[PDB]
Amino acid sequence: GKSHGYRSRTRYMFQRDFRKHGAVHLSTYLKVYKVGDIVDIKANGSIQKGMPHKFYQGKTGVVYNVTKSSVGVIINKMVGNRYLEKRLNLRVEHIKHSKCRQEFLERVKANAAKRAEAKAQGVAVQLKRQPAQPRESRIVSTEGNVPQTLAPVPYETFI
Amino acid sequence: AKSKNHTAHNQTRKAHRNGIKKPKTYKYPSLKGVDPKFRRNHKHALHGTAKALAAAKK
Amino acid sequence: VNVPKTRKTYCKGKTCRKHTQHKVTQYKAGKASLFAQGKRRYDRKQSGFGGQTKPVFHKKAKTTKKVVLRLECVKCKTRAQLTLKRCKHFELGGE
Amino acid sequence: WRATVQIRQKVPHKRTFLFLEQLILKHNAHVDTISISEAKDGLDFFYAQKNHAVKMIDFLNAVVPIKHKKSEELISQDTHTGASTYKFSYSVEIVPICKDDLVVLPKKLAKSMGNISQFVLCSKISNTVQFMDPTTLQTADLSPSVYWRAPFNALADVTQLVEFIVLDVDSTGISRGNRVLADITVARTSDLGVNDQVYYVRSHLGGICHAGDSVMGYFIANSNYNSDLFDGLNIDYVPDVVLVKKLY
RNA sequence: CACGGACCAAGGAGUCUAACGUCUAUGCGAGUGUUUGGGUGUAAAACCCAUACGCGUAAUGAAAGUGAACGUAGGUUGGGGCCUCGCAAGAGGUGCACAAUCGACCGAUCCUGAUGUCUUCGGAUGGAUUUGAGUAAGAGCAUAGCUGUUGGGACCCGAAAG
RNA sequence: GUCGAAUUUGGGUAUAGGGGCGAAAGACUAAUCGAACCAUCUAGUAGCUGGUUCCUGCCGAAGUUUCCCUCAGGAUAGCAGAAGCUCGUAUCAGUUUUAUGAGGUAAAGUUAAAUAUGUAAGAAGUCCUUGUUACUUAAUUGAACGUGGACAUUUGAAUGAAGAGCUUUUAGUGGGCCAUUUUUGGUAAGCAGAACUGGCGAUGCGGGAUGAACCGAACGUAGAGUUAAGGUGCCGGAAUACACGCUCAUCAGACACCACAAAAGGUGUUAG
RNA sequence: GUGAUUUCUGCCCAGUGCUCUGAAUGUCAAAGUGAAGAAAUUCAACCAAGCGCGGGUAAACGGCGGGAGUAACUAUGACU
RNA sequence: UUGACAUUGUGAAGAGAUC
RNA sequence: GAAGACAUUGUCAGGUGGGGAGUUUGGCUGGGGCGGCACAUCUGUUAAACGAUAACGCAGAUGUCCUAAGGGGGGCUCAUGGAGAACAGAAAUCUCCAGUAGAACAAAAGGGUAAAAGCCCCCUUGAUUUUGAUUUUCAGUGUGAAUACAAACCAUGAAAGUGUGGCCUAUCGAUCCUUUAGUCCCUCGGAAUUUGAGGCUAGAGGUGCCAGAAAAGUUACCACAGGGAUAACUGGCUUGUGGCAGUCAAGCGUUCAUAGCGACAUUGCUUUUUGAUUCUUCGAUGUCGGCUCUUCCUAUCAUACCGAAGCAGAAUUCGGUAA
RNA sequence: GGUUGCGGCCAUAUCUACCAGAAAGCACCGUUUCCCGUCCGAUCAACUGUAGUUAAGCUGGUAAGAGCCUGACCGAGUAGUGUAGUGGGUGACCAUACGCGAAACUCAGGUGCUGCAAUCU
């Protein structure tokens, strides 16, 4: 018959990353998670206690709860036509930070600098990010570089 | 007299009619699940800081 | 399986409220005890005419029973119950 | 294939042994076969025509106590002749009680034959199932017809036995044929050394036992049972040890 | 090349009721309901009315039983509207309803167990990741209507039977 | 066929409905017999078949989840309507971009795509300053929440937004089918089962001569103009147009889906 | 139940059934009985018929196999 | 088909600690 | 005259009783039946790189096992190969090297694990108590299994720490009734006492059809309401087969591949085979064969005219147009 | 710069064959009365730093070395794949249009980096 288990069909999913087997390195446990941090869930197949279901692999959530060995995680899960807000209990082997907030705070501070700097510079800030523009004009110099005429090439077997 | 048992066809299309509504998440979320030991102290932290101004505010 | 004849577990006597030594024996049924409300009722409905009025269960499946242990506090004589998983063999003994 | 014979033991698992004997007892009676495909509870046989699936069962009764059912599937017919071509499937089913296992007979059955006891070991299996008093050493048998009327099931499997070692024996004689009733002291093979116990047991098999020899039996004091026929007898009439079979 | 229908006229199918949910209108409103009854009358109408009684205003436990303010009926985030200033833009003051959230209060369950006493009664106090269809300046009662449900022949017609 | 006897038949008579009678057929018992006939209970019950009566306007589905002695049926959620409610610059989005995770199919021969997928791009913000606690610390140190001060619209990427949220209440449905891109069972199938999207059912219109699904395009009533897909010898509205080549077929060929054709032959004819 | 006459009606009483000048100390309700209790009541024994036990029964229902050996080419196979 | 209570009165024998 | 406190009669009680009555005689399902369990579950796969995903798809497993195989701690290293030692051999036991796990970890499969999660020792009962939050299958209901803390009380260890059964993914159960533990609490309502019974809280006894009725056949005498949602029967599609036609010629034939063939196989056709599906029809298309009679096809048996032979004639054989 | 203790990422750190290391520090090494542990002071334990050897550990250097790692308009705009057509092809499959875009192999270079604390002519 059919089988739907708790860890069912996770064969390749919890595997241990070839030549990364063995004991977990110890900066995993030196990392301090706080309420309001955003973290990414990648399971660690060697640590069974505190291990999230195969739905939460790769999902990203916020820390509402900090406890002895574990942290709280709020996920938004699609069921039916709506999103439910899930709370999860996971040990810090299965968590790590997501760098989008580190990079976001780096740009927040730079934006603070530029503005307050530009506050004595008479505005004209241009503090947004703008997409890659169409490339402006230019003049190539053929001097030293001569256009090399190319043409299609005949067919051959070469077997 | 067998039937047609399972299909997912039309289900994603019915899903977007009213279309995947959001958490409607709030300031001050619920403290369900928060550490009871932190939560006990947090009672008295707020309990004290309210009266903190009751000495100043009068 | 096999289990001890003794255990030190948490005991709540109002006297103890601490781990104390207990005496393990195996729970058993107890007498049918007529005059029970449900037997007094069932005696009445079976009277008269209309044959068997209540279901007669032929549907057994399980080949075993769960095992319940009886823990008496050696000190304050209070008791507890505790339940093991299903098993075909059980002895509270030794070996 | 124009016929199939389907045989099911329906037990956990004890009868996986004897299906080996069926193929042996299929081997004497010769006839003709096509294929054999096991099922979880037993064999599927496939035959040519319908005529051999009759001879398969005719010889299947005398060996083993089976009841058989039949169905049909007509694959076609030629509308000119009126003739018909069917696939005949015989479903054969056997009593789910294997030789030398512990049975508890319902009271109605017990007092309809010799008024035998409730505890019985199934001595031998043949065209009728035979039953033996472990202590009283009385004989009775349950024909295959009467078994299917009320379908009781065996109390304990042959795989549930423990090892015993016979200290001494005391014979009362009695035996009718082939048998010796005797009274025996017995200690469990694991129990003998480290502490002690002696279960003084009234048993069959009193001439077969040499002192200190090893014997298998059901130890009921330890054995947990959920059967209904067991809870209803009485607890003072049950022997604590039932001696079954001897090791060589 | 599935079923019904030759044609015409006339009949012909979601009704009533008892008990309720939501919604709307109306009278009064911590109440509300005159019609079981009595007075009366131009006489089955209309008009007038004493006593109760029903729901509501108090919940909670199986029960014995007990029973809602630490405080401007509390704090924090947001809130229509109003008030102040200002040319205005906007900021500040106050913030009903309402949504979130943490507290205080009553009851039940488990824990503690005071000045006291017919020496085993009494239960003060203080708790708790506990629990309730609760309090926290009342909103329900009556009639009417739409729609929905349950029981009734139950939208209409139809069995083999008993 | 039988026709002197187990014969034929009139009247009287006895046996009545779970009964009678039977030289036996479930035969006969008033055209009724595997339980007669008549009235009532009885408008018996039906998850099953058929029917269900006037217009027009606005909106508009489902054949799917879970549970059921559940599979010709219900409860539940989803889709839908109606009633509105608090509000209104505003949080959103079947979309991209930047940033950052997860994956182990195709190819490759441990590595690793394409398309899909999670999060973030700010005021519920940032920096400082000094308060609370019974938790935490070796600790005026942390955590969580706060007071005071400061930075407003290039406020922190693109585009868009017939406004955002909120609740109550109830109908129908719970037989689906096809095409595309993948795929299992099967020898294959107008066969069976899935995955994605689009359609048909519920939908006319122009084209495919014809046709539920293919191509174009979705519909108030008209007028003119311009086109879509398909066409322009005649039926047929529009070139017996123009340009360059190939083919002669004692069954030519003619436009997708689509109403099919092969291995390989042929001093057939053209070009390499 | 069989179906005139003639001629024969084999073997089988384990099963199912029927039957019994048969026997035992098993099981057995109601009433009575004895005990325990303040009482409701609990229990312990006893008990008929019936089944259980043993006998007869096939012109009762019905059944009449399997595995082996063994007679002067093979082979037949009276028998153990 | 059996047992018990009632109809149901009068009293003798012989075994069982009622037949 | 016979019989006699017995028969009889009445009321209870056991037994017997298809002579009779009432009822039942599962579900999915390439028709229904048998089988099976896709009916409660677990692993790999079917699955197309988040999650989700069907078939009576495929390979297997589950109803148990364990006072340690649970918990804590310590020391140590496996499979295997190589080189040595009386008996001793293809392997016993001992010793040193190399040894990324090729071993073991109760069981199915997959993950996980090396001063361990394994092997061996030492101590122990956290497999305890009170209950709330969370994940999973899902309606974000129940059950099962799990996750992380809190309040107690405890095991181990020098200690950090670790443990709420099994290294992880399965191994299980409502109402009603019966019973046990708990506080020694509540009620028996005219007021008390002792039994009895009933409650609150937490367990067990079982529903495998596993969200959970108490249940044998039969109809060829049959009945009803329906179904082409579904069989037998024509048609439609597929062609597995069946039957028919080409291509290469390994080879039979006196030599001789093509007079006459074809094996190996490959490419097609056939609806006069048998099947598969279940599209139309169950408010009916009258079912086999023969008789009678008409017509069409060509895949030519005879007749016509031709080409071929290993055709002298004769004869026969293969092809050609031809219905 | 060497060396030790505790580390961070966990092969650019491993593996294999040779070679050198002054001082200081590690280490080998001596001992068996107390702590304590064994079939055996080998392992662990405790004791001296005295009596010794840098032989091995270890640190470093070498190697057209196996391994590992970083880079390449290197394979390659290749394989594959998303979108589109009343495109082609009897069929299998194949071009074109707008896009995305690899991998082993080969070749070339690299062969540990570093934190706190002490310590050494």
Side-chain angles (χ1 to χ4, degrees), chain A, chain B, chain C, chain D residues 1-12 29-248:
Chain A
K2 298 296 184 179
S3 172
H4 310 293
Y6 184 75
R7 286 182 58 177
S8 179
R9 293 175 181 172
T10 54
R11 179 184 174 92
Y12 299 96
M13 190 167 182
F14 298 122
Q15 289 183 338
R16 189 55 182 155
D17 284 345
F18 169 85
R19 291 198 298 106
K20 288 183 180 297
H21 293 283
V24 294
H25 65 79
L26 290 178
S27 65
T28 297
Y29 301 98
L30 295 168
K31 289 157 61 179
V32 170
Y33 306 102
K34 294 170 63 179
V35 172
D37 286 347
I38 299 168
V39 295
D40 297 346
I41 294 171
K42 183 171 177 287
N44 188 333
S46 65
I47 307 301
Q48 286 87 0
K49 292 181 183 296
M51 188 169 185
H53 183 268
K54 68 180 181 298
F55 181 88
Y56 296 92
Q57 185 76 62
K59 308 297 174 64
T60 302
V62 182
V63 172
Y64 76 99
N65 188 30
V66 183
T67 187
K68 185 176 69 65
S69 65
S70 296
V71 293
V73 170
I74 56 103
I75 300 296
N76 294 335
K77 180 180 178 179
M78 176 178 73
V79 63
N81 55 341
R82 60 174 183 182
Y83 287 144
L84 293 178
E85 178 174 355
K86 295 290 190 178
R87 297 175 183 268
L88 268 66
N89 293 330
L90 298 181
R91 299 177 73 88
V92 292
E93 290 86 1
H94 306 292
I95 300 303
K96 62 172 62 183
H97 291 82
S98 184
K99 292 171 64 180
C100 59
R101 290 302 305 278
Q102 186 174 356
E103 181 176 359
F104 172 70
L105 270 70
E106 293 177 356
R107 187 179 67 84
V108 172
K109 296 183 73 68
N111 290 331
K114 292 190 294 184
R115 179 188 292 275
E117 180 181 4
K119 187 180 293 179
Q121 181 65 257
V123 294
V125 285
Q126 183 67 59
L127 50 77
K128 287 181 177 178
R129 299 176 301 175
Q130 298 296 100
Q133 304 301 320
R135 55 188 180 271
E136 296 301 324
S137 65
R138 287 172 297 178
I139 296 171
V140 306
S141 182
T142 302
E143 177 177 358
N145 190 28
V146 174
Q148 184 178 357
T149 299
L150 293 174
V153 299
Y155 173 73
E156 181 181 358
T157 60
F158 56 87
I159 189 65
Chain B
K2 292 198 297 184
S3 60
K4 174 67 172 174
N5 294 286
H6 175 60
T7 188
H9 183 64
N10 185 25
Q11 309 310 322
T12 59
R13 192 185 61 77
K14 288 158 60 182
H16 295 88
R17 301 297 290 275
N18 294 283
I20 310 298
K21 296 175 180 177
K22 300 302 286 187
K24 306 295 173 62
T25 182
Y26 305 87
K27 180 62 173 173
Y28 296 136
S30 63
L31 293 183
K32 178 184 75 179
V34 177
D35 178 69
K37 189 190 297 177
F38 166 76
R39 182 175 179 170
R40 286 201 299 270
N41 182 30
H42 188 267
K43 172 188 173 184
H44 306 295
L46 297 180
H47 182 277
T49 188
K51 182 176 292 297
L53 299 173
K57 308 306 287 187
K58 61 190 184 70
Chain C
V1 297
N2 195 35
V3 297
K5 293 178 69 66
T6 54
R7 176 178 173 84
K8 272 191 286 294
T9 179
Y10 184 87
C11 185
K12 50 184 176 180
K14 302 293 185 179
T15 60
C16 296
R17 298 186 185 180
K18 68 179 181 180
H19 284 78
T20 63
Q21 188 66 56
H22 287 85
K23 294 175 178 177
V24 170
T25 55
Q26 184 177 357
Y27 171 80
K28 194 175 182 178
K31 186 178 179 180
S33 174
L34 306 177
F35 302 155
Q37 177 62 68
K39 179 65 172 172
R40 283 183 283 112
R41 183 180 299 113
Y42 177 77
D43 282 342
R44 184 173 177 78
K45 181 181 286 183
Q46 283 298 107
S47 64
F49 295 99
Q52 185 64 54
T53 62
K54 211 77 180 295
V56 173
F57 177 87
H58 293 291
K59 295 176 180 178
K60 72 163 67 178
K62 305 290 189 291
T63 53
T64 67
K65 288 183 168 72
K66 293 176 182 175
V67 172
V68 181
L69 298 173
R70 192 184 184 87
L71 298 173
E72 187 187 8
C73 182
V74 298
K75 306 298 180 66
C76 56
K77 72 186 179 69
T78 188
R79 293 178 185 170
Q81 287 178 332
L82 186 146
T83 183
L84 269 56
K85 294 183 180 298
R86 298 186 181 274
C87 53
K88 285 183 175 179
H89 300 293
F90 180 82
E91 55 187 340
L92 60 86
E95 300 295 322
Chain D
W1 56 270
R2 292 185 179 178
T4 185
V5 175
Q6 294 171 333
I7 295 169
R8 304 295 181 271
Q9 196 64 54
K10 289 295 186 179
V11 174
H30 191 283
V31 298
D32 280 340
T33 302
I34 295 172
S35 177
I36 298 169
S37 66
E38 293 181 351
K40 184 176 77 178
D41 280 344
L43 299 176
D44 292 348
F45 290 89
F46 298 100
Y47 293 88
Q49 302 174 339
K50 181 173 175 286
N51 195 344
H52 303 296
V54 169
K55 299 298 183 179
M56 172 65 182
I57 299 171
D58 287 345
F59 293 105
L60 194 36
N61 281 337
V63 174
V64 61
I66 61 104
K67 179 182 180 179
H68 60 78
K69 188 177 182 180
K70 185 179 78 177
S71 67
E72 289 178 352
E73 180 181 2
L74 64 89
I75 50 176
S76 294
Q77 60 180 17
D78 54 350
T79 180
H80 178 63
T81 305
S84 300
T85 178
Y86 298 90
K87 289 194 294 183
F88 301 94
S89 64
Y90 298 92
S91 67
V92 171
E93 192 174 4
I94 307 171
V95 295
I97 54 177
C98 295
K99 180 181 77 180
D100 291 339
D101 66 350
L102 179 63
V103 178
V104 177
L105 300 176
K107 293 176 180 179
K108 298 174 180 178
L109 288 59
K111 58 181 64 179
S112 295
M113 58 199 87
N115 195 339
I116 195 166
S117 178
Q118 295 294 100
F119 274 81
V120 177
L121 298 178
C122 159
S123 97
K124 61 177 205 228
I125 288 173
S126 179
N127 55 33
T128 59
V129 179
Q130 187 181 359
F131 289 102
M132 184 181 287
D133 280 342
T135 64
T136 299
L137 191 140
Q138 193 181 2
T139 56
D141 55 352
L142 189 31
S143 296
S145 64
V146 183
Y147 178 82
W148 293 101
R149 292 207 282 265
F152 67 94
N153 51 33
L155 180 63
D157 295 346
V158 181
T159 65
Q160 200 73 261
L161 283 41
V162 296
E163 292 181 350
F164 293 106
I165 180 169
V166 50
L167 301 179
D168 188 4
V169 302
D170 288 340
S171 295
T172 312
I174 338 194
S175 94
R176 246 180 131 94
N178 198 342
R179 299 179 181 179
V180 173
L181 176 288
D183 189 351
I184 302 171
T185 59
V186 170
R188 291 192 297 275
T189 293
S190 180
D191 176 64
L192 177 138
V194 66
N195 182 345
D196 180 67
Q197 187 60 259
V198 169
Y199 296 94
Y200 182 81
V201 179
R202 187 172 180 82
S203 293
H204 182 274
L205 193 141
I208 291 170
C209 50
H210 172 55
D213 186 64
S214 180
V215 177
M216 294 295 185
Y218 300 96
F219 178 68
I220 278 98
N222 187 337
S223 178
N224 185 345
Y225 298 112
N226 193 26
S227 292
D228 61 352
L229 294 168
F230 184 81
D231 284 343
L233 317 152
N234 192 30
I235 304 167
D236 296 346
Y237 294 133
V238 309
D240 284 343
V241 173
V242 181
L243 295 176
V244 178
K245 185 183 293 180
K246 181 182 77 178
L247 296 178
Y248 298 89

